[PDB]
Amino acid sequence: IETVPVKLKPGMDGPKVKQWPLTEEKIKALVEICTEMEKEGKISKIGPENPYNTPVFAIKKKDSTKWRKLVDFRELNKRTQDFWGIPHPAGLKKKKSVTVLDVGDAYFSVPLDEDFRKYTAFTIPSINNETPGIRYQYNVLPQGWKGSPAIFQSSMTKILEPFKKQNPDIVIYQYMDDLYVGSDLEIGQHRTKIEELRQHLLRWYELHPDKWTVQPIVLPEKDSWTVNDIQKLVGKLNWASQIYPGIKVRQLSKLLRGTKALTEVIPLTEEAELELAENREILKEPVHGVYYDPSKDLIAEIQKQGQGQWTYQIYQEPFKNLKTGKYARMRGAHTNDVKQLTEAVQKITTESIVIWGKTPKFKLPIQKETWETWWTEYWQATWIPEWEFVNTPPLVKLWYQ
Amino acid sequence: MVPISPIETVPVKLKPGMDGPKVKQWPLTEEKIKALVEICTEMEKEGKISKIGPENPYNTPVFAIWRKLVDFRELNKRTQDFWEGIPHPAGLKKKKSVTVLDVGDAYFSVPLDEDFRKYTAFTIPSINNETPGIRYQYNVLPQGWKGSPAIFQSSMTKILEPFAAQNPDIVICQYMDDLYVGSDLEIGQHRTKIEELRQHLLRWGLTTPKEPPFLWMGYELHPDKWTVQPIVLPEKDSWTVNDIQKLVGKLNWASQIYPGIKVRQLSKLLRGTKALTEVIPLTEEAELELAENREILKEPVHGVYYDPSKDLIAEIQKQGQGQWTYQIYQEPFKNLKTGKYARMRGAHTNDVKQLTEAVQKITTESIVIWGKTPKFKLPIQKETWETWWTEYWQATWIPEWEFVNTPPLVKLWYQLEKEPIVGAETFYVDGAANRETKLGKAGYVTNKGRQKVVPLTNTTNQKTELQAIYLALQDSGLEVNIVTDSQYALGIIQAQPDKSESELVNQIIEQLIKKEKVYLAWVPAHKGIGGNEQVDKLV
Ligand SMILES: N#Cc1ccc2c(Oc3ccccc3OCCn3ccc(=O)[nH]c3=O)cc(F)cc2c1
């Protein structure tokens, strides 16, 4: 009920980001929703003396036909003062199950700092520029802004105090508009406990981190190797030598002596099998001196394997993976690559939030224009990670498969 | 006297760390002075400005051309930043009656922030400067002020909102000083509602008075069709850079309704620019291009208006040399609009990528203009696109579309095998070059004993790494395996170009097309891999 004074970083003006084109249906949804929000005192119409603007569009969450309003507060977030720090619950990723909840409805109670409101300005765009866009600014706490959960941390603490004093074994984390609840219960007991917590929040996505672990580097096991097989093996091992100290390939490359046809079978010598075995033993061990630096950015690279299969690696320094994975999940996306990529980025970002507490910077295997054209049509998350575009085909693609 | 409705002012502040502008006044002829006095007198009588005194240390220059010309340059440099594309005729919906209303004294009908009026002060110099100049300040929006258009626009919108809400059976478009009102009502009802509207504007003190065809923003707007205003292409035996910029500009502007407009051969002359004075001759390609553009601009072509109850269709055709053209229509042979797309600046490329990019462009433009994605008619087989997007290393997508058979069709010219080929020869290739003497060697050795090493003058490592592959492609059967240690060459070939700027790469492509099956393998260099003879190209 009381507004806490919020400012910006020294030497940084408010966000002035271009509003991108929207389809007619999304514009209608935004008009209706923002009308309703205006009638509820959540947002208010502003004059032209407000030069700031933040992009806004509409989506549809999982198992819901109701349109939702999403704001790209990225620029505003990076221009918003660094809010100060609760250490990330490292026990969250170690829990058997974790449920994601959308507590965004609770933010619209706390009013926003009057002086800061002009920075949350946004515009609903008109079709064919026939009429000037509708301009709004937030009066309460806007969903997506990094300052909102920071301001609502105390309130959320006072609200969730009885539940935490009741079930101390249930880990609770909060990121943006999302609330993560980790437990070791049973899926039925889990769902009932989630109903209990959500009604607990009322009167005031089912993830399984235990099924998500880290994957190693494996080598093929054959009875008869071809020249091509041994060549690929040597390439993979040579690549892996950047990550592991003792990988040697001289005895395997010794087999490739002479010019043989790629499909010709070569029997492995004893030294070669010994070397391969030693390399396996080395690969079974974890990587040497791999740590997480909270002061550095997280980098997430994604490779398209095909047939719905995607691979990803999260790291900070090259050849020092903090996380590896393979998104093979198929829902409704069979004929669409960009949709699959979007869902993959969402999941990876989610896991990144669970593990480290922040979002990574993606390196996407897609042309800038394609992604920029279609990524909003399949986005369902309330947060938005950073990304860049790699337009040169990586050779390492089949080395993670 | 009926009270004209109060228009709430917009709070204007200067940029922090600044005060009101203070610039001296320039000497004017007595004619100018008298004219400005006569103007500002009746201006004061109308309540647009007011007399002030020495209490205001702020002043901005003013000239006269009678017409008063106040310079707010420095005040613009001191004024804060405000908010605020033109509507496209193709997106406009066909209406039975359309009225154009231009409000006279647009800025002078909107009150200025009273706490900001003190900064819009100017001084008319008296004769011979034997007296302190006459002092004035603006009480309304000044002509040429930074904040005038935005504030006037917002005011106009605030005034128009209730009439629009109360009249859903008529559509209103707002643009600067003008309002455009369309309706499908009867002409009498329409004129009545127009009079109602200008009455509603008169309540707030806005005075309103053109007939089709409307000459608006380079467009000609007819009741049932739209086009562009006649394009004037100068014909000079001696061209300059600025003339090429103007020419390309006009061609671009004309290309939104005139299909087939090409501008590549004229745009290639704009490299190494920023010198506005030059004499650049044209190639036969450029002369024929401009002549073809004159051939298209020979007879006028019109576009129709948008009808929401019909599908939106966009058809694309390849024009060659990175050029693509498209037509957006709903009914056959009746275009809503047309357009073109030129390939980006790259070293290697293919048709599918350029087509995709084009599709993206048309999609964005369409979402801007009509607020929806059109169905696409593309010159590419479903199986071609299928194979492409399924075997592409990047993620790619094209919205709902259908194959139209109007040549030239976009195809895949070659497809690398995923696995090594049984019964095919195996070419271990390699190439290297001396960094100092620019002398290199490129060649191969095969499993059947076939070898070759070619000496090359003036070349690089990468050029030889490509040359070896080219050699392998030349002297091999319809099916061939190729082993290389060049990450560069593999990096190029995996990007699947069908056209390149390097002749060597182009020749490699031409060789690839003639093949049935080609498997390209990669290996680490200098790892003592037999077959991969680096020692054969090092001598
Ligand atoms: N000078 C001038 C100018 C004039 C009109 C403009 C304009 O007409 C409309 C304004 C409001 C509702 C419908 C309108 O039209 C749709 C298509 N359309 C156009 C002309 C005609 O004669 N008939 C017809 O069907 C829209 C616009 F965006 C700019 C306009 C500019």
A242 Cβ partners below 8 Å, 6+ apart?
A319
- In the sheet that holds A386-389, the strands lie side by side as A321-327, A309-315, A299-306, A361-364, A386-389
Distance from CA of A297 to the nearest CA of B (A): 24
Of B153, B154, B487, the CB nearest to A395: B487
Window 7-36 of A, Cβ < 8 Å to B: 16, 21-24, 27
Which structure tokens are listed for B297? 């601009």
CA–CA separation, A292 and A272 (whole Å): 37
User: A48 vs B357: CB contact, 8 Å cut-off?
Assistant: no
In sign, the C-alpha dihedral spanning B294, B295, B301, B306 is negative
Instruction: Report whether B12 contacts B72 (CB < 8 A).
Output: no
Q: Is B195 exposed, middle or buried (0-12, 13-18, 19+ CB in 10 A)?
A: exposed
CA–CA separation, A84 and A294 (whole Å): 15
3 state SS for chain A: CCCCCCCECCCCCCCECCCCCCCHHHHHHHHHHHHHHHHCCCEEECCCCCCCEECEEEECCCCCCCCEEEECCHHHHHHECCCCCCCCCCCCCCCCEEEEEEHHHHCCCCECCCCCHHHHCEEECCHHHCCCCEEEEECECCCCCCHHHHHCHHHHHHHHHHHHHHCCCCEEEEECCEEEEEECCCHHHHHHHHHHHHHHHHHCCEECCCCCCCCCCCCCCCCCEEHHHHHHHHHHHHHHCCCCCCCCCHHHHHHHCCCCCCCCEECCCHHHHHHHHHHHHHHHCCCCCCCCCCCCCCEEEEEEEECCEEEEEEECCCCCEEEEEEECCCCCCCCCHHHHHHHHHHHHHHHHHHHHCCCCEEEECECHHHHHHHHHHCCCCCCCCEEEECCCCCHHHHHCC
Of A16, A49, A129, the CB nearest to B11: A49
Residue A89 one-letter amino acid: P
Q: For residue B174, what are the β-bridge partners? A: B179
Residue B93 CA to ligand 1 centre (angstroms): 8
Q: For residue A311, what are the β-bridge partners? A: A303, A326
Question: B59-90 burial, b if ≥16 CB within 10 A, otherwise e?
Answer: bbbbebeeebebebeebeebbeebbeeebbbb
HSE-CB of B444 using CA atoms within 13 angstroms: 28
DSSP annotation of B479 reads: E
CA–CA separation, A54 and B84 (whole Å): 14
User: A258 vs B531: CB contact, 8 Å cut-off?
Assistant: yes
Our separate counts of H helices and E strands in chain B read 12, 23
Which positions in chain B touch A249 (Cβ < 8 Å)? 527
Packed helices B487-494 and B461-474: angle between N→C axes, nearest 10 degrees: 60
Instruction: Please give the full DSSP string across B138-188, using - where no structure is assigned.
Output: ESBPPTT-TTHHHHHHHHHHHHHHHHHHH-TTEEEEEETTEEEEEESS-HH
The residue whose CB lies within 8 Å of the most ligand 1 atoms, and thus the one to mutate among B221, B225, B304, B368, is B221
Which structure tokens are listed for A3? 């507004």
Q: For residue A299, what are the β-bridge partners? A: A315, A361
Instruction: Report whether B332 contacts B353 (CB < 8 A).
Output: no
CA–CA separation, B508 and B512 (whole Å): 6
% helix, strand, coil for chain B, step of 5: 30, 25, 45
Q: Does A188 touch chain B (CB under 8 A)?
A: no
Residue B519 one-letter amino acid: Y
Comparing CA positions, the residue from A293, A312, A276 lying closest to residue A358 is: A293
Comparing CA positions, the residue from B231, B212, B215, B234 lying closest to residue B223 is: B212
CA–CA separation, B518 and B427 (whole Å): 11
A95 Cβ partners below 8 Å, 6+ apart?
A171, A182, A183, A184, A209, A210
Q: For residue B378, what are the β-bridge partners? A: B403
DSSP annotation of B260 reads: T
Instruction: Report whether A14 contacts A118 (CB < 8 A).
Output: yes
Q: Is B173 in the pocket of ligand 1 (CB under 6 A)?
A: yes
Which structure tokens are listed for B538? 């090092």
Instruction: Report whether A329 contacts A355 (CB < 8 A).
Output: no
In terms of DSSP H, where are the helices of B370-486? 382-391, 461-474
Angle, alpha carbons A203-A207-A210 (nearest 5°):
125
SS3 B250: helix
Which structure tokens are listed for B521? 């393998």
Which structure tokens are listed for B306? 């948008």
Q: For residue A300, what are the β-bridge partners? A: A314, A362
User: B92 vs A128: CB contact, 8 Å cut-off?
Assistant: yes
**Rounded to whole angstroms, what are the CA distances from A291 to A300, A317, A321, A360?**
16, 10, 9, 16
Instruction: Please give the full DSSP string across B292-349, using - where no structure is assigned.
Output: HHHHHTTS---B--B-TTS--EEEEEEEETTEEEEEEEEETTEEEEEEEEE--S-SEE
Dihedral in degrees, nearest 10, Cα atoms A280, A281, A285, A288: -90
CA–CA separation, A43 and B412 (whole Å): 53
Q: Does A251 touch chain B (CB under 8 A)?
A: no
Residue B90 CA to ligand 1 centre (angstroms): 10
> Least CA distance to B16: which residue of chain A?
A13
CA–CA separation, B128 and B134 (whole Å): 13
Which structure tokens are listed for B31? 């004619």
**For residue A196, is it left (φ>0), alpha (ψ between -120 and 50) or beta?**
alpha
Q: Does A257 touch chain B (CB under 8 A)?
A: yes
SS3 B100: strand
Which structure tokens are listed for A342? 């979007």
Residue B88 CA to ligand 1 centre (angstroms): 10
Q: Which one of A259, A275, A370 would you mutate to disrupt binding with B, by most B Cβ within 10 Å of its Cβ?
A: A259
CA–CA separation, B427 and B477 (whole Å): 11
Which structure tokens are listed for B371? 């607020």
Dihedral in degrees, nearest 10, Cα atoms B89, B90, B92, B94: 110
Every domain of chain A and the residues it spans = 5-90+116-156, 91-115+157-206, 207-292, 293-401
Residue B202 CA to ligand 1 centre (angstroms): 22
Which positions in chain B touch A259 (Cβ < 8 Å)? 426, 428, 445-447, 530-531, 533
Of A127, A370, A392, the CB nearest to B396: A370
Place of tokens 């020979």: B298
Comparing CA positions, the residue from B127, B122, B111 lying closest to residue B31 is: B127
Comparing CA positions, the residue from A121, A285, A96, A287 lying closest to residue A208 is: A96
User: Gap positions in chain B, given as the residue before each gap (C–N > 2.5 A)?
Assistant: 65, 84, 209
Please report the beta strands in B200-312, taking only residues with DSSP state E, as ranges in sequence order: 214-216, 219-221, 226-228
B172 Cβ partners below 8 Å, 6+ apart?
A131, B160, B163, B164, B179, B180, B181, B182
Helix (H) or strand (E) holding B431: strand B425-433
CA–CA separation, B537 and B539 (whole Å): 6
HSE-CB of B430 using CA atoms within 13 angstroms: 21
| Residues in chain B, overall count | 539
Q: Does A168 touch chain B (CB under 8 A)?
A: no
Name all contacts of A115-119 with Cβ < 8 Å and 24+ positions apart. A115/A5, A116/A6, A116/A7, A118/A14, A118/A46, A118/A50, A118/A52, A119/A8, A119/A14, A119/A15, A119/A52, A119/A76, A119/A79
Q: What are phi and psi of B57, to 5 degrees?
A: -80, 10
User: A23 vs B86: CB contact, 8 Å cut-off?
Assistant: no
SS3 B207: coil
**Rounded to whole angstroms, what are the CA distances from B340 to A258, B68, B254?**
55, 44, 11
Q: What is the resolution of this structure in A?
A: 3.0
Residue B178 one-letter amino acid: D
Q: Is B98 in the pocket of ligand 1 (CB under 6 A)?
A: yes
User: A132 vs B151: CB contact, 8 Å cut-off?
Assistant: no
CA–CA separation, A357 and A326 (whole Å): 21
Instruction: Please give the full DSSP string across B141-153, using - where no structure is assigned.
Output: PPTT-TTHHHHHH
Q: Does A238 touch chain B (CB under 8 A)?
A: yes
**For residue A7, is it left (φ>0), alpha (ψ between -120 and 50) or beta?**
beta
Instruction: Report whether B311 contacts B276 (CB < 8 A).
Output: no
Q: For residue B226, what are the β-bridge partners? A: B221, B303
Which structure tokens are listed for B90? 């193709």
Q: What are phi and psi of A295, to 5 degrees?
A: -90, -10
CA–CA separation, A103 and A175 (whole Å): 10
| Residues in chain A, overall count | 401
* Residue A182: count of CB within 10 angstroms of its CB: 22
Q: Does A49 touch chain B (CB under 8 A)?
A: yes
> Least CA distance to A365: which residue of chain B?
B394
In terms of DSSP H, where are the helices of B370-483? 382-391, 461-474
**Rounded to whole angstroms, what are the CA distances from A330 to A99, A230, A309, B182?**
21, 33, 9, 49
User: A22 vs B371: CB contact, 8 Å cut-off?
Assistant: yes
HSE-CB of B200 using CA atoms within 13 angstroms: 18
Comparing CA positions, the residue from B42, B36, B23 lying closest to residue B124 is: B36
Comparing CA positions, the residue from B401, B354, B408 lying closest to residue B379 is: B408
Q: Which one of A119, A231, A252 would you mutate to disrupt binding with B, by most B Cβ within 10 Å of its Cβ?
A: A231
Pairing of strands B479-484, B517-522: parallel
Q: Does A245 touch chain B (CB under 8 A)?
A: no
Comparing CA positions, the residue from B205, B242, B22 lying closest to residue B103 is: B205
Q: What are phi and psi of B70, to 5 degrees?
A: -90, 130
CA–CA separation, B531 and B539 (whole Å): 17
Distance from CA of A388 to the nearest CA of B (A): 14
Comparing CA positions, the residue from B170, B146, B172 lying closest to residue B159 is: B172
B355 Cβ partners below 8 Å, 6+ apart?
B316, B318, B324, B378, B379, B380, B410
CA–CA separation, B219 and B228 (whole Å): 4
CA–CA separation, B269 and B264 (whole Å): 9
